[PDB]
Amino acid sequence: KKALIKEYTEEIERLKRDLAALEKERDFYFGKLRNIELICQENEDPVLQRIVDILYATDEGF
Amino acid sequence: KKALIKEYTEEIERLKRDLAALEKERDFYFGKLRNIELICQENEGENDPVLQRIVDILYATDEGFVIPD
């Protein structure tokens, strides 16, 4: 019983550390895209339009 | 205990679903930024101030320092 709890709690602790690092990385990249999205809206250029297409590549609106 | 393993298996199974969902989100965002970086690299010979601002966002660390590539 004690050995099983020891193994699973160590596995859970490892998964939760990887989850925290992955979500931190996800929010880090999402912040970059939103700041780039802000720059494209301020300067609303054929180069910027290609960047806008990437930002909303999977957007079905409009 | 069979009810102890079930308590920990379903918890690990829950965390692995969260990991798979987060990794898909990160790769989605990182793929966009990588495509944006390549567009800026193809047009860097003009020293466009707007594109340089975008590059400085791509290459900024979490402390705010820009590491060029």
PDB file of C-alpha atoms in Angstrom, chain B:
ATOM      1  CA  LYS B   1      -6.288  -1.267  -2.326  1.00  0.00           C
ATOM      2  CA  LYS B   2      -8.206  -1.402  -5.593  1.00  0.00           C
ATOM      3  CA  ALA B   3      -9.952   1.846  -4.595  1.00  0.00           C
ATOM      4  CA  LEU B   4      -6.573   3.506  -3.967  1.00  0.00           C
ATOM      5  CA  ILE B   5      -5.247   2.647  -7.432  1.00  0.00           C
ATOM      6  CA  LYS B   6      -8.510   3.848  -8.993  1.00  0.00           C
ATOM      7  CA  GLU B   7      -8.203   7.145  -7.111  1.00  0.00           C
ATOM      8  CA  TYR B   8      -4.664   7.671  -8.442  1.00  0.00           C
ATOM      9  CA  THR B   9      -5.177   6.197 -11.926  1.00  0.00           C
ATOM     10  CA  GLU B  10      -8.099   8.505 -12.734  1.00  0.00           C
ATOM     11  CA  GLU B  11      -6.093  11.457 -11.377  1.00  0.00           C
ATOM     12  CA  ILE B  12      -3.049  10.652 -13.529  1.00  0.00           C
ATOM     13  CA  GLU B  13      -5.405  10.027 -16.455  1.00  0.00           C
ATOM     14  CA  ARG B  14      -6.889  13.480 -15.833  1.00  0.00           C
ATOM     15  CA  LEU B  15      -3.475  15.177 -15.769  1.00  0.00           C
ATOM     16  CA  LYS B  16      -2.391  13.453 -18.991  1.00  0.00           C
ATOM     17  CA  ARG B  17      -5.485  14.757 -20.786  1.00  0.00           C
ATOM     18  CA  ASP B  18      -4.618  18.248 -19.549  1.00  0.00           C
ATOM     19  CA  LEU B  19      -1.043  17.816 -20.797  1.00  0.00           C
ATOM     20  CA  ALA B  20      -2.200  16.699 -24.247  1.00  0.00           C
ATOM     21  CA  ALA B  21      -4.628  19.626 -24.500  1.00  0.00           C
ATOM     22  CA  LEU B  22      -2.025  22.184 -23.398  1.00  0.00           C
ATOM     23  CA  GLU B  23       0.639  20.820 -25.752  1.00  0.00           C
ATOM     24  CA  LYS B  24      -1.775  21.145 -28.678  1.00  0.00           C
ATOM     25  CA  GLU B  25      -2.458  24.768 -27.711  1.00  0.00           C
ATOM     26  CA  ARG B  26       1.246  25.593 -27.361  1.00  0.00           C
ATOM     27  CA  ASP B  27       2.177  24.019 -30.698  1.00  0.00           C
ATOM     28  CA  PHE B  28      -0.686  25.959 -32.288  1.00  0.00           C
ATOM     29  CA  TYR B  29       0.574  29.299 -30.947  1.00  0.00           C
ATOM     30  CA  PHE B  30       4.250  28.460 -31.529  1.00  0.00           C
ATOM     31  CA  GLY B  31       3.492  27.496 -35.127  1.00  0.00           C
ATOM     32  CA  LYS B  32       1.973  30.922 -35.759  1.00  0.00           C
ATOM     33  CA  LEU B  33       4.960  32.731 -34.240  1.00  0.00           C
ATOM     34  CA  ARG B  34       7.379  30.594 -36.257  1.00  0.00           C
ATOM     35  CA  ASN B  35       5.489  31.455 -39.448  1.00  0.00           C
ATOM     36  CA  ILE B  36       5.550  35.135 -38.451  1.00  0.00           C
ATOM     37  CA  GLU B  37       9.301  34.969 -37.782  1.00  0.00           C
ATOM     38  CA  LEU B  38       9.941  33.575 -41.264  1.00  0.00           C
ATOM     39  CA  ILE B  39       7.866  36.335 -42.877  1.00  0.00           C
ATOM     40  CA  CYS B  40       9.870  38.952 -40.980  1.00  0.00           C
ATOM     41  CA  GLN B  41      13.127  37.250 -41.995  1.00  0.00           C
ATOM     42  CA  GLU B  42      12.089  37.368 -45.663  1.00  0.00           C
ATOM     43  CA  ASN B  43      11.519  41.140 -45.371  1.00  0.00           C
ATOM     44  CA  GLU B  44      14.268  42.168 -42.936  1.00  0.00           C
ATOM     45  CA  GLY B  45      16.397  43.823 -45.633  1.00  0.00           C
ATOM     46  CA  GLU B  46      14.144  46.903 -45.554  1.00  0.00           C
ATOM     47  CA  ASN B  47      14.643  47.757 -41.848  1.00  0.00           C
ATOM     48  CA  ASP B  48      10.899  48.314 -41.518  1.00  0.00           C
ATOM     49  CA  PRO B  49      10.293  49.777 -38.025  1.00  0.00           C
ATOM     50  CA  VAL B  50       6.963  47.955 -37.692  1.00  0.00           C
ATOM     51  CA  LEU B  51       8.463  44.578 -38.604  1.00  0.00           C
ATOM     52  CA  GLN B  52      11.364  45.209 -36.215  1.00  0.00           C
ATOM     53  CA  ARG B  53       8.850  45.760 -33.405  1.00  0.00           C
ATOM     54  CA  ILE B  54       7.239  42.420 -34.263  1.00  0.00           C
ATOM     55  CA  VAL B  55      10.663  40.739 -34.286  1.00  0.00           C
ATOM     56  CA  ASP B  56      11.468  42.285 -30.902  1.00  0.00           C
ATOM     57  CA  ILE B  57       8.267  40.700 -29.575  1.00  0.00           C
ATOM     58  CA  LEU B  58       9.156  37.295 -31.038  1.00  0.00           C
ATOM     59  CA  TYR B  59      12.693  37.363 -29.612  1.00  0.00           C
ATOM     60  CA  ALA B  60      11.868  38.830 -26.188  1.00  0.00           C
ATOM     61  CA  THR B  61      12.570  36.711 -23.120  1.00  0.00           C
ATOM     62  CA  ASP B  62      10.198  36.558 -20.154  1.00  0.00           C
ATOM     63  CA  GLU B  63      12.371  39.259 -18.536  1.00  0.00           C
ATOM     64  CA  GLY B  64      11.885  41.618 -21.498  1.00  0.00           C
ATOM     65  CA  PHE B  65      15.346  41.222 -23.056  1.00  0.00           C
ATOM     66  CA  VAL B  66      15.563  40.737 -26.821  1.00  0.00           C
ATOM     67  CA  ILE B  67      17.839  37.923 -28.028  1.00  0.00           C
ATOM     68  CA  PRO B  68      18.218  38.215 -31.829  1.00  0.00           C
ATOM     69  CA  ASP B  69      18.580  35.310 -34.236  1.00  0.00           C
TER      70      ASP B  69
END
